[PDB]
């Protein structure tokens, strides 16, 4: 059928991108067994994970640019096969630069996998049903991150790290051929019906860069609170470490439900509206969630004391996680929808570049401001940036969103 | 007395800075008689006035930096004497590079005059009485611009341009010695009572750069509407040229009363409040006037047709002029108040540098956006910048405003 093939292809992308994220962070999942086996420095593990982070940033960008050129099926399957071959060779490795370079090459093949999922979700799913299945295909990532330390801890208690990495790499090699056989990058290959723009016309469209600065700010404020919310509760607000861990756990669970609810309710808005070329029906919940970020950072900064209860901290974590991982899924969905259909992966990679810029701006200058002035001053600077960007994106909510040529 | 010397010194600065602005724009006031006398190109006059504009920008900055080093009395009097000597030599000039270089040197000596007025108004007037006399000392500039073409047209009908420039230069030479004799840069020279910070501690204070970007945006939007409001009424909105001229005249008259009302009501707020080091009681009307800019640009963009009456255009011009020249006087008053007392001219020159940046951003890119997309799209981009900066400055209204060291 039609929806049958949508189900089959989404199950294949779900399994493939779940194995992507599990084999993206297996070395951090099997890390305790491996540091029991071989002694490695904290700076050594930081260099390995930083090699993967640098290669994954470069490869998200390069793969988004490539995914609009060659086929998403072969690119996805090649990514999964090459990730599996990396984990096979990584289980078959003992020396440290082999770990670092092979995990760099895993970071490349992990970047090489999600813009195929974006292209296939664009070409196969209606815009009334695009954000919700984007959000479930990122819930694949969240489910891999949730079931990864559990299964890796069981396989590291039972077997070694080499046997676990070898089984996971062999599983990716098998699922790479299964995703080569169960994915069609467009319905024109089957026979079903589908659903002229240059990269210069993409880059000169101002909505891509309004979207880029918006996702810069939203991912920067997400990474600010995700990295330093425990520290803001320990040093400044005077909570315990269990309260900070519960705050992070509530932010993650609220972020999972925030991404899913953002996709579903934004597809409801996209199904209701959709007559004009200017504006975007997804702004009508992207703006409410960015205002939710503003309200959550304000109420977490001024209405949190040492005497405020743990339930208020959990509510602020959950509502900020809702209001924060919602817009990240929405800037993904908009950078894939509002783009031309043959240049949507490139328009998504341009916004992931600003994800990298926001990650750096949340890492070093936010910690510098927190070191010099105070913690509440730094989180307030992040609040001002997020609220001023919520205002600047409320103003810019009705610009020409359909990127590309003008007709 | 005390208020007697405040009256005498303010009358001397009023006469001196009125002759500053009259001898700043005498060559554009006596321009028709001079182009009847000698033939000059439009590009030639543009080069002469651009030489004065470049030298006056460089000299506003250099003189603000200098006015905190040497005395404001001798710097003011030297500026007025050197402006008078330029107009004497300019009346005694015939050839074109002599005009251009001597008017460059006038632009230098015109920049060399207002930061002495800022220093004397800081050292002599209370913060409850500082913004209103700042606004009257800029009403000196507006009165010179209002009575300048009238008196210059009368003196160009009666006498020549050489006789008019010679009388105006001789008047500046006389009033330079009268302002050397009737100004005291601080009350410590008389005997009355007055009312430790480095430039690095100025530049590292974030309120100077919040104030700089705020004045960047406010002066840029002022220069956008001041240059292109007639063009927005001619090409886009379909008004006549008389409606655009009345719009500019209503914006200028409303701007005069806006600067004066901003100074007076902001000094009322500064007199009422004043207990804390964070925030500024002048924000409590700077924000209302920046929101007045936002509301005025919105109501002038969406609620102006060809069938809207001329009275609505005059009301929008007057309310935008109010809401626009108010904040320019207020960013001057705040860059002179919130600064340390021996480094206030430098903190004001740093904000005049961003006036130059906003003038360029209103000149070329605003015209480029208006050429490519539309006129309403360009004025809407200016509206978005002004409203997003009004939001970002409403958030940043309670940062540490007292620039300098922390104690």
From Swiss-Prot, chains A, B:
Inhibited by vanadate and chlorogenic acid. One of its GO terms (cellular component) is endoplasmic reticulum membrane. Inorganic phosphate and glucose-6-phosphate antiporter of the endoplasmic reticulum. Transports cytoplasmic glucose-6-phosphate into the lumen of the endoplasmic reticulum and translocates inorganic phosphate into the opposite direction. Forms with glucose-6-phosphatase the complex responsible for glucose production through glycogenolysis and gluconeogenesis. Hence, it plays a central role in homeostatic regulation of blood glucose levels. It is linked to Glycogen storage disease 1B: A metabolic disorder characterized by impairment of terminal steps of glycogenolysis and gluconeogenesis. Patients manifest a wide range of clinical symptoms and biochemical abnormalities, including hypoglycemia, severe hepatomegaly due to excessive accumulation of glycogen, kidney enlargement, growth retardation, lactic acidemia, hyperlipidemia, and hyperuricemia. Glycogen storage disease type 1B patients also present a tendency towards infections associated with neutropenia, relapsing aphthous gingivostomatitis, and inflammatory bowel disease. It is a multi-pass membrane protein. Pfam families: MFS_1. The gene is SLC37A4. It comes from the Eukaryota. Coiled coil: none annotated. Changing residue 179 to R: In GSD1B; inactive glucose-6-phosphate transport. Belongs to the major facilitator superfamily. Organophosphate:Pi antiporter (OPA) (TC 2.A.1.4) family. NCBIfam families: 2A0104. This is Glucose-6-phosphate exchanger SLC37A4. It comes from Homo sapiens (Human). The chain crosses the membrane at residues 80-100, 101-121, 135-155, 163-183, 201-221, 242-262, 284-304, 311-331, 350-370, 376-396. Changing residue 145 to E: In GSD1B; inactive glucose-6-phosphate transport. InterPro entries: MFS, MFS_dom, MFS_trans_sf, OPA_Antiporter, Sugar-P_transporter_CS, Sugar_P_transporter. It catalyses: D-glucose 6-phosphate(in) + phosphate(out) = D-glucose 6-phosphate(out) + phosphate(in). PROSITE patterns: GLPT, MFS.
């Amino acid at each position: 059928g039609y929806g049958y093939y949508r189900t089959v292809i989404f199950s294949a992308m779900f399994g493939g991108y779940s194995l992507y994220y599990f084999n993206r962070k297996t070395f951090s999942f099997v890390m305790p067994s491996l540091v029991e086996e071989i002694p490695l420095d904290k700076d050594d593990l930081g260099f390995i994970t930083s090699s993967q982070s640098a290669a994954y940033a470069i490869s998200k960008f390069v793969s988004g640019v490539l995914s609009d050129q060659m086929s998403a099926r072969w690119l996805f399957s090649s990514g999964l096969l090459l990730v599996g071959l990396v984990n096979i060779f990584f289980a078959w490795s003992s020396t440290v630069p082999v770990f670092a370079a092979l995990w760099f090459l895993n970071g490349l093949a992990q970047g090489l996998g999600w813009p195929p999922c974006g292209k296939v979700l664009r070409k196969w799913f209606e815009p009334s049903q695009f954000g919700t299945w984007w959000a479930i295909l990122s819930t694949s990532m969240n489910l891999a991150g949730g079931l990864g330390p559990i299964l890796a801890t069981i396989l590291a208690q039972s077997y070694s790290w080499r046997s676990t990495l070898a089984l996971s790499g062999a599983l990716c090699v098998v699922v790479s051929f299964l995703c080569l056989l169960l994915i069609h990058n467009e319905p024109a290959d089957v026979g079903l019906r589908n659903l002229e723009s240059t990269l210069q016309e993409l880059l000169l469209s101002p909505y891509l860069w309004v979207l880029s600065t918006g996702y810069l700010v939203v991912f920067g404020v997400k990474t600010c609170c995700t990295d330093w919310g425990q520290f803001f509760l320990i040093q400044e607000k005077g909570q315990s470490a269990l309260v900070g861990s519960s705050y992070m756990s509530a932010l993650e669970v609220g972020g999972l439900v925030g991404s899913i609810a953002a996709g579903y309710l934004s597809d409801r808005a996209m199904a209701k509206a959709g007559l004009s070329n200017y504006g975007n029906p997804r702004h009508g919940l992207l703006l409410f969630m960015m205002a939710g970020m503003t309200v959550s950072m304000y109420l977490f900064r001024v209405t949190v004391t040492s005497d405020s209860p743990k339930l208020w901290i959990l509510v602020l974590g959950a509502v900020f996680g809702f209001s924060s991982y919602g817009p990240i899924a929405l800037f993904g969905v908009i950078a894939n929808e509002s783009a031309p259909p043959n240049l949507c992966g490139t328009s998504h990679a341009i916004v992931g570049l600003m994800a990298n810029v926001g990650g750096f701006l949340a890492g070093l200058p936010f910690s510098t401001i927190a070191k010099h002035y105070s913690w509440s001053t730094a989180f307030w600077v992040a609040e001002v940036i997020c609220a001023a960007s919520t205002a600047a994106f409320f103003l810019l909510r009705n610009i020409r969103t359909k990127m590309g040529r003008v007709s």
